[PDB]
C-alpha cells in the first residue's frame, strides 16, 4: 500500500491556552477531603498549547488540507479532540517511525479498541483506510494503508474502546475527548476522559481528571509520533479520501508540583501549579 497524499502547507500553528487542563491522578491511593502535592510530569496551566489542523477545509470549493506532521514526543504528550464524526483512531508512537525500534500502534475500528506494540514499517503518509466490503455489506478498515510490514511483534493487547460515541445530540456536546500519554519506568500509561462542550472550538475553564486506563510493561523510549486517520472512498462525482473535518489539540508535558484538592466524593476538582 503506502498510498501517499502530502499536499503542501503548514500555516502558522494556531495556538490556544489550556486554562485548567490535563490533571491526571498522581497515585492509585484514594484520597477524600485531603490535600496531596506531588511533583510529576503534567501540562502546566495556561501554557502554550498547539491546536492542529488535520484534514481541513478552508472554503472555496472543497480544499481539504492534510497537514498532520510527525511530531516529537519530547517529555510527555497531551491530546484533546471533539470529532462528533470519528476520523481519529490511534497514534503511531515510536522513535524511528520505522523498523530498527519497536512501535506503539494504537487503532480503533471498534467493536473494541486494540493496542499493538510491535515492529512495523510506517509509510510516508500513514493512516487507516476504510472501504466498503459489499459482502456482509459492512465498512472494513484497511490497516496497511498505515504500515506495510507487521512482524517481530513484542506485545499485543485488546480492551473496550477508548474512543466512544454517544451522539443523537446534534452538537451541544461535541464529545470532547482527551488522552494523556506518559512514558516512564517501563510503564507507558494511558488516561482518558469524555466531556460535553458547547463552545465552538476551544476549551472551557472546567477541570478534567483522567483515570489511568492500562499501565503497560512497555520498555521503549518514544521520541516522536503522529496521529492516525479514518478516510474512505467515493464514486463518480465532479485518490478519494477525507471524510468530514478533523482538528485536535496537542501539548507537551513537564515536571511541575500540583497540589491536588480531592472532593468529599474523592474525585479531584481544583489543581494548582
Amino acid at each position, epitope marked *: 500500500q503506502c498510498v501517499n497524499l502530502t499536499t503542501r502547507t503548514q500555516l502558522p500553528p494556531a495556538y490556544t491556552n489550556s486554562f485548567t487542563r490535563g490533571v491526571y491522578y498522581p497515585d492509585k491511593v484514594f484520597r477524600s477531603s485531603v490535600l496531596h502535592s506531588t511533583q510529576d510530569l503534567f501540562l502546566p496551566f495556561f501554557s502554550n498549547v498547539t491546536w492542529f489542523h488535520a484534514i481541513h477545509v478552508s472554503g472555496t470549493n472543497g480544499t481539504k488540507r492534510f497537514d498532520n506532521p510527525v511530531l516529537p514526543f519530547n517529555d510527555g504528550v497531551y491530546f484533546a479532540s471533539t470529532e462528533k464524526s470519528n476520523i481519529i483512531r490511534g497514534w503511531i508512537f515510536g522513535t524511528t517511525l520505522d523498523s530498527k525500534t519497536q512501535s506503539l500502534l494504537i487503532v480503533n475500528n471498534a467493536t473494541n479498541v486494540v493496542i499493538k506494540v510491535c515492529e512495523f514499517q510506517f509509510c510516508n503518509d500513514p493512516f487507516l483506510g476504510v*472501504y466498503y466490503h*459489499k459482502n456482509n455489506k459492512s465498512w472494513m478498515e484497511s490497516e496497511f494503508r498505515v504500515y506495510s510490514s507487521a512482524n517481530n511483534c513484542t506485545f499485543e493487547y485488546v480492551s473496550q474502546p477508548f474512543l466512544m460515541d454517544l451522539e443523537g445530540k446534534q452538537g451541544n456536546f461535541k464529545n470532547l475527548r482527551e488522552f494523556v500519554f506518559k512514558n516512564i519506568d517501563g510503564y507507558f500509561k494511558i488516561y482518558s476522559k469524555h466531556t460535553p462542550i458547547n463552545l465552538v472550538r476551544d476549551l472551557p475553564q472546567g477541570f478534567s481528571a483522567l483515570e489511568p486506563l492500562v499501565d503497560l510493561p512497555i520498555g521503549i523510549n518514544i521520541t516522536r509520533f503522529q496521529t492516525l486517520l479514518a478516510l474512505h472512498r467515493s*464514486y463518480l462525482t465532479p485518490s478519494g479520501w477525507t471524510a468530514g473535518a478533523a482538528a485536535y489539540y496537542v501539548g507537551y508535558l513537564q515536571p511541575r508540583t500540583f497540589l491536588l484538592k480531592y472532593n468529599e466524593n474523592g474525585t479531584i476538582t481544583d489543581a494548582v501549579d
Partner: antibody
Amino acid sequence: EVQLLEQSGAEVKKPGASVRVSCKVSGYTLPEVAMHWVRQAPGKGLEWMGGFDPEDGETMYAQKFQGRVTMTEDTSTDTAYMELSSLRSEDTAVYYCATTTPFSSSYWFDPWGQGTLVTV
Amino acid sequence: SVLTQAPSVSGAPGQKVTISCSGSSSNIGNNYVSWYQQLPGTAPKLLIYDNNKRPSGIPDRFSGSKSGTSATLGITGLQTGDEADYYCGTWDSSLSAVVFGGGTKLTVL
C-alpha cells in the same frame, strides 16, 4: 481516480472450447465496487451480461444468457473470472468489463476494461 | 435490443441537434437513464448519467431530459470529432437486468 487492468487479453479459442475472463483493477480494491459485463458484437450493439446486483447483494446473471456464463471473485488479487461456455455461432464478440458503484443504485457502467474479443 | 433508436443520423457541423431514445414505464419510467459513446474499435465512453449529470471530462455542451417513457440526449456544438454511435440505457426490472438500444451512429456533415 482509477484505471483498470485488461479484461482478458487476446483469447482465441477454436470451437469446442470455453474461456474465462479475468478482469483486474487498480487504484481500488476489488470488493468495494461491483463489476459488470456487456456483449458487444462488432458492427452491432450492446448486450448486457453478468453483473452484480446492488440490491439483494447477489451477482446477477443475464436471464437470456443465464447458466452458460458464471463469475467468481478473488478479493485480494482483484481477479474476477467470467467463464463463458458452450461456444456457438454468434457468441464470439467483445465482452466488456464494466463496473457500477458498490454503494449501489447506479446503472452506469463507469470506467471499463478496453474490450476483449472471444473466439468460437 | 428492447429499446427504440435509429441506426444513424446526420447533421452539419457546429449545429445543434439531439438524439432521443423511446422506452417504456417498465424501463425508463421508474429508472435512471445513461448514455454512452464509442469510436470505431474503441472503448465505449459514458456520456451522461441520470440524463442530468456529466461525468468528469465531459463537455458541458451536452444535456439530457426524460419525458415520460422518452429520454432525449442533448447534443450541442457539433464537432468534426463527434461522429460516433450513442447508446441509451436504463435499469430494467422486467427481466431484472440492464438493457440497451441498438445504437445510433451520428454523422457530422
